[PDB]
Design a protein around this ligand. Structure first.
Ligand SMILES: Nc1ncnc2c1ncn2[C@@H]1O[C@H](COP(=O)(O)OP(=O)(O)O)[C@@H](O)[C@H]1O
Ligand SMILES: Nc1ncnc2c1ncn2[C@@H]1O[C@H](COP(=O)(O)OP(=O)(O)O)[C@@H](O)[C@H]1O
Ligand SMILES: Nc1ncnc2c1ncn2[C@@H]1O[C@H](COP(=O)(O)OP(=O)(O)O)[C@@H](O)[C@H]1O
Lengths: 740, 490
C-alpha cells in the first residue's frame, strides 16, 4: 500500500496464546484502543483475528506474537504483516472444532470436559476458519482445528455460547508445521547466545537472493560448543524451524559406525542432499567423534574421514548458501584444521544456565504438567546449582512420575481403568519436587560457572570511596571512550585489592561485575595451588580464553599470594617471587586484546609476598586497600547481613557496632549465624516440648530472633585478625605511599 | 590441495599426484601449488602406517624427478616450517624458504583499503584508528571484519526499512554508507583476533620520542650503522664488528625505547623477548625454543634481537646469595650457544638489558658476545623537560603550565614516574570532563558545547601529590659502585 500500516513481527513475552501486544505510540497512531480486536493479514491470503495490549519495552515497528498465532498467519519470524481495525464483534453461537489424530492418540477421556471446560470458561476468544489452536494439560498439549463456524467466517465466543465437539480427529494438513516442533520460545536459559545466532543466520536464510545480488562474505561455519545436554541440537532445530530452512541432521557415531568407505559416501551424499534443498542447515552432532585431534587419530580410516570432511567444508563455499552448524563438548578437543577460516570461523559458547535461566527452563518444562499451588520454582531454581537443561527436564519428569507413583495409580488400580480425569487431578506438590531434587538426580557438571552475580551495592556496608573508584575504573573506559581517546590516556586493565581477610574484596568484585551487567569468573586459591602442584600451569591460558569468550567480563583472582606462601612465607623457599603460575598470568595479561572489556581483578591479604613484577603498568597497577570497618560501616554490615533473617525490634545494632571494635567483616557474620543457631535450637526444643503435650496442635511461638540471644552469641566472639596484621598493613601503606 | 589428495583411497592419491605433475609438465611454464603441505608430508614421528610414508616418498621422488629440463616451479605452503618432513627441505626439492608473516600497521591499513575498495564507506571512517586497533589480525581477519561491518550496515537499516514497501534494488546499495561506529562494532566484539605469536616489525618509535641520552644515541648509531654502511673501513683496518650491547641501569629509563629507536632508524625488524618468556622457558624446562627465536632473527634479517630483563632467571632462583649454584642457567646457556654460532655477518644485532647487572652470568660479557656495556643513567633537568614534552605532546595541555618547574621539583625521578604523573593528571582531567558532562545533563530547564579540554594547571598540583620514586637512592648507589669498581679499580 506503501503507506504506514505494516509492521515487523518478532518474539513474544506474554503467556496468553491468543493476543498481540503493541507499543503505546503505535496504538494511538494506528487509530486503535487498548483491548480492541483487529484483523492480522499475512501471507498466502491467510488472516486472523486478535486482541491488542500495551507493552512499553517492545518498540514501535515491532509486534509481540506468540508461536501459535504467528504460525496461524502462514508467516514466519521476521516478516511483515498488515493490521486492520475491526470492532465488528460477530458474537458466536456454536463452534465445530475437532482435534488432530496425530496429537490425539491413546488419550482415553472425554476431551471436552478435561481440556476445553476451563479453557473457554468466561473466555472471550475470537475464532476464524483455518485456525489451529492448542490447549495444554494432563501432561499433554492438544491441537484443535475449527472446521465449521456458525457466524461465517469468523466469530467471538461469549461465556454463554455453547461449544460443540462432535466428530473424529482429522489428519493434519501439508502446510502447517506442527507445534510439537521446536521454536525459540522453548529455549530458556540461552536468550543471549540466541541473539548472536539469529543475527548470524538471519540474512543468509531469510533473504537468500540478497547475497546473490551482493559481493560480501557470508558466515558459513558455526561451531556451537558447551558441555553435553545443554541444548545445542535444540538450538539448531529451533533456528531451522523458525527460519523455515531445511534441516539435515548428521550424527557423529551414526556415520562413524558404518563400514570404511560407507561413511564417506554418507557424508558426501548428505552434503549433496543439503545442497539440493537450499536454503539448508547441516548439523553435524558430536563433531569430536568424527574429527578429533591428530594425536588421538591413528589408522588411515580415521584421518581419511577427517580429510573428507575438510574437503567438503572447503568445497561448499562456492555459490551455495548452506550453513553448517557443528556441536562439540570442548572446542580444543577437535581437529584444529577445522577452525581455520572458510570452514569453522564462527564459534559460539552455549554454557550452563544460571538462576533466571534455570527458572525459565523449569517454566518451559512444567508447561503442561498442572503444578500444585505450593510449588515455588524460585526455591527449586535456587537449589539447582550444577544442572543443565537435560537435568532439569529429567527432574520435572521424575517429579511427575513420583506424583503418579505415590497415589492415583495404585489407588485406582483395583476399581477403574486409565482415564484423563486422574491426569487433570494430578497436582505435583512442592514436596514432590523436593524429593526429585533431593537425592534421585546427580547434577552432572562441576565446571567453572560464568554468570552475572546477584550481589548489589547495598549488600556491602561502608566503603563508599572504593565504590566510586571501582565505578570510575570499570565504567568510564566503556561509557566514554571519546574522552580517553581525546586526552590520549590509556585505560588501566587491573586492580589489586589488599587488606585484612574477610572485609569485602569478593563482595566488591561481584558488585562491580553486577552493576555493569558483565560476567564474573572467580578463580580461588585452591585452583592456583592445583595448577602449581600438578605442574600444569598451561591451564591458565584456558581461563583467559573463557574471559574472552564471555566478554564483557570481570576475571577475579582472589588469594593471589597462595602459591607465594605455600612455599613458605617471608623467608620461605630460597628462591625469588617468580612462580610457575603467576608467570603465566603475566604472560596472558600482557598478551590480551587492546580493549576486549575484560577487567582483571586481584586480591591478596598478604601484599608483601606477592610477585612485584605484577604491580607494573600494563598489568594490575591500581592498589586499593580495603580497610577494617568503622561503626558507621559496621551498622550497615550488620543490617545487610540480618535483613534476610527475621529479627526483633528492641535489638540495637549500634550498641553491637560500639562493642565490636576492630572486628573484621566475617566476624560480624559469624555472630549473626551463631545467634540464628541459638534461635533455631530454641525453636526445635520448644516444638518437642509442645509435642510432649499429651493431655488434650498449636501455633509455634513468635519466631523473631530476639535480644539476649546476641548476648550469648556475643559471648563466643573472636577477632580473626590480630593488631599485628593491622600494623603490617599500616606499614605497607606508609612505606609504599609516603617514604619518599 | 592437501586434504583433497589425502582424502582419496590408497593408490588413488599417488595417481593424482603423478598425473598432476604430468599435467603441469605438459603445460610448461607452470606453477604447482601444494596447499597445506604439512597434511601430506608431516614429520616421521607423526607418520605411522605404510599408506602415509608411501605418499611422502612419492612426493619426494616427483620433486627429485622434475629437475631435468622442465621449468616447473613448485610453491608449497605450510603453517610452520619445522612441522613438515625434513627430507623435503634438502637441496633440489625445497631450497628457497619464504616467511610471509603477519601484517603490521601500514600493511593492515593497506589491507583495509584493499577490501573496502568498492564498499562506499562513510565520511567519518578513519581507517588509521582501525588499523591501529587491529593488533593480531591477519588478512583473513580484516577481510571478515570489513564484510561483517558491511553486513551490519545492511542489517540495521536499508533492509528492514524497505522490507515492506519495495523489493531489492541497486539504489539502496549505493546509498549504504558504513559508518565509523559500524566498524567500531564489528571490531568491538564480533571478531576474535586469531593469533598471538611473536610480532616482527619496524617499531614506530623515533629519536625524538626519547628525552636526553645524546651520547648513547651516537654510540648506538656507531655500533649499529657503521659496520653495514662502511664495511671497507672495517676490512681495511682489520677490526671485527661487535654484535652485542648490554644496557644496564635503573628500571624505567629508556632501554626498550633506545632499542626500538635504533631499530627504527636503520629500518630493521625488531624482536622483543621479554622476561616472562625466558621464565616460561626455564620453568617449562624447554630451553630448546631459544634456537627457534634466533631462527626468526635469521629469517627477518636485518634485525635487532632484544632480550630485556635478562636477569629474570638469575633472580627467580633467589637474588645475591639465592640458590647455592653458580650463574649458569638452562636458558642463558642456550643464548651463549646460539650467539657464538651465528653467521659471520647476517646483520642481526643482539641487544640485552638488565636492571641488576651484578647477578647476570659473567660468561656473556666476554668478546664475541654482548660486550659493550652501556649504562643508562637517571635523567637530569635538561633531559626531564624533554621527557615530559615527549610524553605530553599527544595530549592537549594548557599553555600556562611550566614543565621546567616540574623537572626542577621532580629530582631523581625515573623516566616511568614522569609518565605516571602525566597519566594521573590525564585521569583527573577525564574525571572532571565526564562529571561536568553529567552536571550539564542535569540541565532540564531549557545541548551545549563541552567546556575547553586543555589539561590545565592545578591538575598537576594534584597528580604531583601522589608522586612516588620507583628507585631508592640505594639502587643508585649500587649502580655507582658497579661502574666505579668495574671501570676504575685497577
Ligand atoms: N536450553 C534449553 N532449553 C529448553 N530445553 C532444554 C535446554 N537444554 C536442554 N533441554 C532439554 O534437554 C534436552 C537435551 O537437548 P539436546 O539438544 O539433546 O542437548 P545436546 O544436543 O547439547 O546434547 C532437550 O531436548 C530439552 O528436552
Ligand atoms: N563490608 C562488608 N559488608 C557486608 N558484608 C561483609 C563485609 N565484609 C565482610 N562481609 C561478609 O563477610 C563474608 C566473607 O567476606 P569476603 O568478601 O568473602 O571476604 P574477602 O573480602 O576476604 O574475600 C561475606 O559473606 C560477607 O557477607
Ligand atoms: N628518557 C626517556 N624519554 C622518554 N620517555 C621515557 C624515558 N624514560 C622512560 N620513559 C617512559 O617510560 C616508559 C617505560 O620505559 P621503558 O623504556 O619501558 O623502561 P625500561 O628502560 O626499563 O625498559 C615508556 O613508556 C617511556 O614513555
Amino acid at each position: 500500500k506503501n503507506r504506514p500500516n505494516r509492521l515487523i513481527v518478532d518474539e513474544a513475552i506474554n503467556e496468553d496464546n491468543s493476543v498481540v501486544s503493541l507499543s503505546q505510540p503505535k496504538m494511538d497512531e494506528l487509530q486503535l484502543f487498548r483491548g480492541d480486536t483487529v484483523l492480522l493479514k499475512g501471507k498466502k491470503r491467510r488472516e486472523a483475528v486478535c486482541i491488542v495490549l500495551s507493552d512499553d519495552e517492545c518498540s514501535d515497528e515491532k509486534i509481540r506474537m506468540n508461536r501459535v498465532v504467528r504460525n496461524n498467519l502462514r508467516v514466519r519470524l521476521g516478516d511483515v504483516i498488515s493490521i486492520q481495525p475491526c470492532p465488528d464483534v460477530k458474537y458466536g453461537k456454536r463452534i465445530h472444532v475437532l482435534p488432530i489424530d496425530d496429537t490425539v492418540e491413546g488419550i482415553t477421556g472425554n476431551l471436552f470436559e478435561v481440556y476445553l471446560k476451563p479453557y473457554f470458561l468466561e473466555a472471550y476468544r475470537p475464532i476464524r476458519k483455518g485456525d489451529i489452536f492448542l490447549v495444554r494439560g494432563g501432561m499433554r498439549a492438544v491441537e484443535f482445528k475449527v472446521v465449521e463456524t456458525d457466524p461465517s467466517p469468523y466469530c467471538i465466543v461469549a461465556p454463554d455460547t455453547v461449544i460443540h465437539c462432535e466428530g473424529e480427529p482429522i489428519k493434519r494438513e501439508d502446510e502447517e508445521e506442527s507445534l510439537n516442533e521446536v521454536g525459540y520460545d522453548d529455549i530458556g536459559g540461552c536468550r543471549k547466545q540466541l541473539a548472536q545466532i539469529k543475527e548470524m543466520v538471519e540474512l543468509p536464510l531469510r533473504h537468500p537472493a540478497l547475497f546473490k545480488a551482493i559481493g560480501v562474505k557470508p558466515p558459513r561455519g558455526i561451531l556451537l560448543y558447551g558441555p553435553p545436554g545443554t541444548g545445542k541440537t535444540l538450538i539448531a532445530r529451533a533456528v531451522a524451524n523458525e527460519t523455515g530452512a531445511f534441516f539435515f541432521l548428521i550424527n557423529g557415531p551414526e556415520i562413524m559406525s558404518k563400514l570404511a568407505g560407507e561413511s564417506e559416501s554418507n557424508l558426501r551424499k548428505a552434503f549433496e542432499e543439503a545442497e539440493k534443498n537450499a536454503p539448508a542447515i547441516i548439523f553435524i552432532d558430536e563433531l569430536d567423534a568424527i574429527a578429533p585431534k591428530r594425536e588421538k587419530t591413528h589408522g588411515e580410516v580415521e584421518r581419511r574421514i577427517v580429510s573428507q570432511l575438510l574437503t567438503l567444508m572447503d568445497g561448499l563455499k562456492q555459490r551455495a548458501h548452506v550453513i553448517v552448524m557443528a556441536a562439540t563438548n570442548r572446542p580444543n578437543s577437535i581437529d584444529p584444521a577445522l577452525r581455520r577460516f572458510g570452514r569453522f570461523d564462527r564459534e559460539v559458547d552455549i554454557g550452563i544456565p544460571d538462576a533466571t535461566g534455570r527458572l525459565e527452563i523449569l517454566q518451559i518444562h512444567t508447561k503442561n504438567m498442572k503444578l500444585a499451588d505450593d510449588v515455588d520454582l524460585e526455591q527449586v531454581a535456587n537449589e539447582t546449582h550444577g544442572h543443565v537443561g537435560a537435568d532439569l527436564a529429567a527432574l520435572c519428569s521424575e517429579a511427575a512420575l513420583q506424583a503418579i507413583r505415590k497415589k492415583m495409580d495404585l489407588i485406582d488400580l483395583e476399581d477403574e481403568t486409565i482415564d484423563a480425569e486422574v491426569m487433570n487431578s494430578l497436582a505435583v506438590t512442592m514436596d514432590d519436587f523436593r524429593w526429585a531434587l533431593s537425592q534421585s538426580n546427580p547434577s552432572a557438571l562441576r565446571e567453572t560457572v560464568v554468570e552475572v552475580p546477584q550481589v548489589t551495592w547495598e549488600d556491602i556496608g561502608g566503603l563508599e570511596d572504593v565504590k566510586r573508584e571501582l565505578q570510575e575504573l570499570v565504567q568510564y573506559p566503556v561509557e566514554h571512550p571519546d574522552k580517553f581517546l581525546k586526552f590520549g590516556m590509556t585505560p588501566s586493565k587491573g586492580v589489586l585489592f589488599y587488606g585484612p581477610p574477610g572485609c569485602g574484596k569478593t563482595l566488591l568484585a561481584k558488585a562491580i561485575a553486577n552493576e555493569c551487567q558483565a560476567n564474573f569468573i572467580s578463580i580461588k586459591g585452591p585452583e592456583l595451588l592445583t595448577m602449581w602442584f600438578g605442574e600444569s600451569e598451561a591451564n591458565v591460558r584456558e581461563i583467559f580464553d573463557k574471559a574472552r569468550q564471555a566478554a564483557p567480563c570481570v576475571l577475579f583472582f582472589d588469594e593471589l599470594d597462595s602459591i607465594a606462601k605455600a612455599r613458605g612465607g617471608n623467608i620461605g623457599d630460597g628462591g625469588g617471587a617468580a612462580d610457575r603460575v603467576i608467570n603465566q598470568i603475566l604472560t596472558e595479561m600482557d598478551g590480551m586484546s587492546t580493549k576486549k572489556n575484560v577487567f582483571i581483578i586481584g586480591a591478596t591479604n598478604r601484599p608483601d609476598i606477592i610477585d612485584p613484577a605484577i604491580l607494573r603498568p600494563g598489568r594490575l597497577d591500581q592498589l586499593i586497600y580495603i580497610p577494617l570497618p568503622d561503626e558507621k560501616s559496621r551498622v550497615a554490615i550488620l543490617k545487610a547481613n540480618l535483613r534476610k533473617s527475621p529479627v526483633a525490634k528492641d535489638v540495637d545494632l549500634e550498641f553491637l557496632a560500639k562493642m565490636t571494635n576492630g572486628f573484621s567483616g566475617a566476624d560480624l557474620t559469624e555472630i549473626c549465624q551463631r545467634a540464628c543457631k541459638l534461635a533455631i535450637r530454641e525453636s526445635i526444643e520448644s516444638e518437642i516440648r509442645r509435642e510432649r503435650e499429651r493431655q488434650t496442635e498449636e501455633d509455634d511461638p513468635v519466631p523473631e530472633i530476639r535480644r539476649d540471644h546476641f548476648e550469648e552469641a556475643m559471648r563466643f566472639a573472636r577477632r580473626s585478625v590480630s593488631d599485628n596484621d593491622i600494623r603490617k598493613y599500616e606499614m605497607f601503606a606508609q612505606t609504599l605511599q609516603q617514604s619518599r
